Assembly symmetry: C3
Homo-oligomer: 28 residues x 3
């Protein structure tokens, strides 16, 4: 599961970047 874990962590990071970019957008 070492490679599996890494791919799931990378997947998760895209949802966190999305969350953040929407909050930045709102401020502008």
């Amino acid at each position: 599961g070492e490679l599996a874990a890494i791919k799931q962590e990378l997947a998760a990071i895209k949802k966190e970047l999305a969350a953040i970019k929407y909050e930045l957008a709102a401020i502008k």
Copy 2:
């Protein structure tokens, strides 16, 4: 080695995502 290093890269990124989400939240 090169494979191992990916876990430290991920660690770094998760810490900075946390920081950023908290900083944005705090502002709003």
Copy 3:
């Protein structure tokens, strides 16, 4: 290969985080 793909995904993420930190900095001013 698997390493190649992952290095590009990490690059991509650091570029987006960089952009965000600069944009956040600008806002706090």
